[PDB]
């Protein structure tokens, strides 16, 4: 697996991932590559586990200290994209945190909310039962 053209770290993984996925959803591509991290791979797994991401392969370079991840887009019949919007609530400058009882809902709570809380990365519905608060990063729908 060779690309002949490397990819760089932009300013922060969180912003870059959402910008790239939105660019993929708007520019009609099939394969898009990003930087990889444990938080990154966790977010990708929790997105793909419920039909929002697609087949993703993470590659590790020959020096075992570098790794990136390529991921396909969630498409459906008759050429229609599935990602209908991403909004990053969190920011490198502003780190807004909310308690458990005020966990935000995705327009009815029917979308997907990412809660990277002290008990790892968990979605809204599963974390509601735990009665455990956490942080909110991005609404995806």
């Amino acid at each position: 697996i060779t690309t002949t053209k490397p990819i760089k770290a932009h300013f922060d993984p969180v912003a870059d991932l959402l910008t790239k996925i939105n660019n993929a959803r708007k520019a009609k591509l099939m394969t898009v590559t990003t930087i990889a991290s444990k938080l990154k791979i966790a977010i990708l797994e929790i997105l793909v586990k419920e039909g929002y991401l697609a087949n993703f392969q993470v590659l590790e370079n020959k020096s075992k200290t570098k790794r990136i991840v390529t991921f396909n887009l969630k498409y459906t019949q008759r050429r229609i994209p599935s990602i209908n919007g991403v909004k990053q609530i969190s920011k490198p400058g502003l780190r807004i945190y909310r308690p458990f009882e005020k966990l935000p809902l995705v327009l009815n709570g029917l979308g997907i909310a990412i809660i990277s809380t002290s008990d790892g990365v968990m979605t809204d519905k599963v974390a509601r039962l735990k009665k455990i608060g956490g942080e909110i990063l991005a609404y995806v729908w």
Binding site: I1, T2, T3, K5, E45, K62, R67
Partner: protein
Amino acid sequence: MQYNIILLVDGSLSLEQANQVNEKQQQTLTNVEGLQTEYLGLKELAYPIKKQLSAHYYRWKFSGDNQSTKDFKRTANINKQVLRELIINLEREYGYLASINPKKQQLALQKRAKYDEIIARENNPENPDVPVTSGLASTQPRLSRTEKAQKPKEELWDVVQKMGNFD
């Protein structure tokens, strides 16, 4: 460094006094060695300088330090028996990069297209072909290897169609 000095001798005096003046003003350099002395004959002036019409150009090539040029320059400028004392240094537009050697073929190849001794020649003075060698890679590849894949899926190719029922 490298240096070239082009000098205009005074008037149209004979070659013997010309060489005498050349060496006399050449001994004005502070400590430069490895020099060379050449001559370029007699040429007329397309425009009068002070009152004369002909002169000799003399080209001296040498190399040395950057702090051994003031004396000769000022001595030539003060003396009234010289006309032009132009100086050229390697800062002039140049190229001698060590990878320019394969230009030898070029120096002949164009002459191949300009060669002509008969009037029935039908060769190509301009034919852009650039004979292909298939060696064009000058970028660094970055090889990589995968680790795992979670929930693989195969994507159907693009199809744009509707109207499944008409009859």
